[PDB]
Amino acid sequence: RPMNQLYPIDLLTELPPPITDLTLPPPPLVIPPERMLVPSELSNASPDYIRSTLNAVPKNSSLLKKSKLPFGLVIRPYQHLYDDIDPPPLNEDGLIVRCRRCRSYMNPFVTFIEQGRRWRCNFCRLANDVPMQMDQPKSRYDRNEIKCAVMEYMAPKEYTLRQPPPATYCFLIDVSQSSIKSGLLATTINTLLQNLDSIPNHDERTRISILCVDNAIHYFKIPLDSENINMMDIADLEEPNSMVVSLKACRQNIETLLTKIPQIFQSNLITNFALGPALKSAYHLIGGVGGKIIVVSGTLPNLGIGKLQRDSFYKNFTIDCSKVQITVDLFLASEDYMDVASLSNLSRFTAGQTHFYPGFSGKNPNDIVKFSTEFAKHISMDFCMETVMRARGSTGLRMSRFYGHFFNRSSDLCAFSTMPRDQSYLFEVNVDESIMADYCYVQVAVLLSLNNSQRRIRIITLAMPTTESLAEVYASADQLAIASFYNSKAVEKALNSSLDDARVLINKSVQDILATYKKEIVAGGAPLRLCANLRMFPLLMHSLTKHMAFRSGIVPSDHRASALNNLESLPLKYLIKNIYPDVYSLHDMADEAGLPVGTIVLPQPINATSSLFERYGLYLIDNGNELFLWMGGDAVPALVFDVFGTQDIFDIPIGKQEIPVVENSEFNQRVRNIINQLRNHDDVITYQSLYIVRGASLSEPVNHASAREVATLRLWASSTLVEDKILNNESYREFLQIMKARISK
């Protein structure tokens, strides 16, 4: 058969690294048309929904342990923030063919035997009876479950215990003093105000609630607009109708309230924020049906249960939440310590998310922009409720570990009180008994309640060839999936053992492989051998160690936790970019680059090293978190002009600021063009701030104050070019050399 072939390469001969590989699709899934009932591209699972670290599964345990390649699944149920974009095919008839034993769903890999009267399950080979209903002007072969790997169903009454819930939101807002002065409150209110129609309300049932919190928990009763403020304070921290209201039936009132709030706590001098008590208050407010508690704050919990200092009550809160289908989202914004490492556990185990805004301050018109944009996109995001996800494996395969935000205790079942759209997940697969067939399969199932009062089941079926050839296992390895696997292993090792252990683990993943390929595969001199499809793995793991999440050296507690929270839940495509940045060479940009083809054309990316940063060029760095506009100190006044308006390069805007519009400068338009293209994503809420940094010249003048402020930028931006030597960490070139030295005799 067409089993992918091993393409040997010398890593030492590919420097700088062929970073264009980061954008290639993983190795093909070698499955002949016969194993598929209706051969099409849509017949096997796409990499956008599921990616196995191995697309040529070892036929037995001893061969997997020998490869030293991990067996895991990068699973992403949804592909966009809004469900109306590129949805999978939807079934409505209600017929759900499922194996009597393993309970797997009908899929493109089942086999119809005996006059197509009965079907043999591809997961457990059991003979099942074909419902006569499977033949009602079309045949059984026109049904999605048989045509597609990725499809969805309208769940019958027996997949729901209670009636689908309305999307419910409870905004737990920090009205303490730190919040007034920073403007977080204003910005938060204003944003809700500007997006009350952006919140999903596909069934007109969406219900909203509002809790303002300082040293007391402030509630508000909201009348139906049709029957035309009531603030209810509660200082007893040891302690429904018209509290959680219809967004449609009380629109004007909700708006009226939101407009008053800012005036109320305007002169608030209280510096208290009883998160714990507020959380429990919100809890009792929606525990009846379940929903999202969205917290916004810029003040470390300091009163009531759950208070923290420079805990575990939260970990118990999440357990309770799993009982009443509640998800918690956190927006932490302040210059002060917020203990993200600890609050992130709230979101983490409820399927929610945490977003941290270091140094937030309304005094910087650009801070507001980032927080507001992300917050708005966040509340506009579609989500499910009462969802549970499980991955079934064909005979011999077993799901052992589960990573990502969600609740999972001692099962192969992950519970999502609400399943967001912007995260990704990962399952470790084990191979117990030896596989007999030439194919093994994995089927992910999602029993959900959409935000349209509907009960659905989304299925993802993946078929992979089996093999006893080590060479073959390697040739079909998904470097980006594998990288992801170890990224998670690293987050665990750290958040549970130690940072150094993490690095040690990351570097070993690369050694074990380079060592394994060497001894188990067979003229030249002294090269570092590896196959082409894994040619970016060493670079990624190495680059990973320089990431703010695993770095050696000093990194503030909040920033570190934040970095770790993001890496563990980010979608593959954004994870790789966060580890290795897209860098663009602007001054010698191609004429198409910067202009449309309303989608703009971007230049080709250049390696992440300062060796390419000519001292007279223009570079833009995108690390998924921010954008860095670096302009060489020796920039010709002409270039300096086309971008900022002046010829004086020492007059340029510094720090976190946007690029001014320079009229009659097609170049200024192309730059601004590219920036905005890098900011438009329909699958993440991320709003990347721009940091403008000035390189150093041969004749650099006197500005002692700036010197400090600027040295920080050149430093920060410099630390992004992960191929370079940085501090006590070696360059990528050296990294490769060090590895050659270790796998030798």
């Binding site: 499922r98 309970r103 027996e158 997949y159 729901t160 215990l161 009462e386 549970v388 499980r390 099962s411 079942l413 519970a415 199932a445 029993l447």
Partner: peptide, 8 residues
Amino acid sequence: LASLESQS
């Protein structure tokens, strides 16, 4: 809700 997903 695993009870429902497994439909056992």
